[PDB]
Design a protein around this ligand. Structure first.
Ligand SMILES: CC(C)C[C@H](N)C(=O)O
Length: 366
């Protein structure tokens, strides 16, 4: 890790834990600095305020409190911090897609995009909108990280959970896979499986992944991954509308997806890409995205049940992560590998939310 930085006391708790993986940290930091400390379509105070709205969806006081202070240091009108109603109508129009991005991105529709781009006194342009979608999803994914790693307040360790053999069964089952129409059914099975001051910055506070207005667990509709991908569709849309941010996102997605030390717990010299692919593809499954050429049976073979409960809680209900839940899975793995799982999951989650929003923009433009 970036040890001298981490133990210096000069960067915040979140960045300290990110430093555990220097190759991801660089990509994280570049986007962070772009969004919050580089001139762009939106003014500094608007961007911090948009981030407060995003973090409030998950009741994340670490991130709300952090952006509240920056908003004020950068010249934001303090009255906006009394709640959304005091904020410009342009910022308020973002509430619906904030909520949907955070909890049910598959519900994002071109009619949502239409309401946003609607001609009026203060209209969203496409570069402004794209920067705001990136801001919203970035702080949603960061709320996952904050809760999943037990990141402590800056007020008076950086984590309540970290502190800066079934492994052999797992390693064996990985080797089997490498050596080698129910496939649509195995996806459906994995997807249907079920496991206060901030209130003034949101609409519909109790809206979440699970729909309690209906019986039975949450099952998003199935989306065929190939219909709209990052590599072929989404990346290209963002580099056209927000060039300086698409490249940095693409680099972050690949930095996380390919990150490896070729270690598995106490063990070395192991290809772990089947395992990491299953963590990624499970999370995308949770958001309804199906990859054709993937056997979703691999998820249950590779991801123990305590790991799936943790992954799904951190991605869909981060407020509800506990130390016990963090401790219960992968008992013999290193802490850094737990942090690694959290990186994979925030990136998988963010790409899914983004792609649904980007698909909706594309459908609107046609
Ligand atoms: C266990 C996995 C999350 C990561 C593993 N430590 C690797 O280097 O690939």
């Amino acid at each position: 890790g970036l040890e001298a930085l981490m133990s210096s006391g000069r960067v915040d708790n979140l960045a300290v834990v990110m430093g555990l993986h220097p190759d991801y940290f660089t990509s994280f930091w570049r986007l962070h600095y772009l969004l919050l400390h580089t001139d762009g379509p939106l003014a500094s105070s608007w961007r911090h305020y948009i981030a407060i709205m995003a973090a409030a969806r998950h009741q994340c006081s670490y991130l709300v409190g952090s952006h509240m202070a920056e908003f004020l240091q950068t010249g934001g009108d303090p009255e906006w911090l009394l709640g959304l109603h005091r904020a410009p109508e342009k910022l308020r129009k973002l509430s619906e897609i904030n909520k949907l991005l955070a909890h049910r991105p598959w519900l994002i529709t071109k009619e949502h995009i239409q309401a946003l781009l609607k001609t009026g006194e203060h209209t969203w342009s496409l570069a402004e909108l794209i920067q705001a979608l990136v801001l919203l999803t970035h702080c949603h994914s960061l709320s996952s990280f904050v809760f999943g790693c037990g990141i402590l307040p800056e007020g008076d360790p950086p984590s309540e959970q970290s502190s800066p053999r079934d492994v052999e069964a797992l390693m064996e089952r990985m080797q089997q896979l490498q050596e080698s129409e129910e496939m649509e059914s195995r996806f459906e099975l994995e997807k249907s499986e079920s496991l206060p001051d901030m209130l003034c910055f949101v609409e519909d506070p109790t809206f979440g992944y699970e729909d309690f207005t209906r019986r039975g667990a949450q099952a998003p509709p199935t989306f065929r991954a190939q219909d709209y991908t990052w590599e072929d569709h989404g990346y290209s849309l963002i580099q056209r509308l927000y060039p300086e941010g698409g490249q940095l996102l693409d680099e972050k997605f690949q930095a996380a997806y390919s990150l490896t030390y070729n270690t598995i717990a106490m063990h070395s010299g192991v290809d772990t890409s089947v395992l990491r692919r299953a963590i990624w593809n499970y999370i995308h499954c949770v958001f309804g995205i199906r990859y054709d050429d993937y056997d979703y049976g691999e998820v249950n073979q590779l991801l123990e049940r305590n790991l799936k409960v943790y992954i799904k809680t951190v991605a869909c209900y981060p407020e509800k992560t506990t130390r016990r839940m963090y401790n219960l899975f992968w008992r013999h793995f290193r802490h850094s590998e737990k942090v690694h799982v959290n990186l994979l999951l925030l990136e998988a989650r963010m790409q899914a939310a983004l792609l649904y929003a980007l698909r909706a923009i594309t459908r609107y433009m046609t």
